[PDB]
Amino acid sequence: MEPTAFSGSDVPRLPRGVRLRFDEVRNKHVLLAPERTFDLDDNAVAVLKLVDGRNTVSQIAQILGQTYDADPAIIEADILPMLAGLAQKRVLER
């Protein structure tokens, strides 16, 4: 009754029956949800695709942060709230 609470130690992981897909026509990544599909940015799916299994947002922020050369604090703070939004769609679970 309160899935909107992803902390730094909270590691994201895609649930079974879900796969990532890249739309060349739209040039953006989307999440295949049992219901249908949701429009998402490559950056939001990048971390989900870059992670082999369960990684800490802070850790990803470092690697991803160096890619765009930006303060990791912003990067982690960007995806962090995204996890809560995804949970509402029933496609993410700690």
Curated annotation (Swiss-Prot):
Quaternary structure, per UniProt, is: Monomer. Interacts with PqqE.
Annotated region PqqD: where?
A: 3-94
Organism for this UniProt entry: Methylorubrum extorquens (strain ATCC 14718 / DSM 1338 / JCM 2805 / NCIMB 9133 / AM1) (Methylobacterium extorquens)
**Shown part of the complete sequence:** 280 to 372 of 372
Q: What name has this protein been given in UniProt?
A: Bifunctional coenzyme PQQ synthesis protein C/D
Q: Which family does it belong to?
A: In the N-terminal section; belongs to the PqqC family. In the C-terminal section; belongs to the PqqD family.
The UniProt function text for this chain reads: The PqqC region is involved in ring cyclization and eight-electron oxidation of 3a-(2-amino-2-carboxyethyl)-4,5-dioxo-4,5,6,7,8,9-hexahydroquinoline-7,9-dicarboxylic-acid to PQQ.
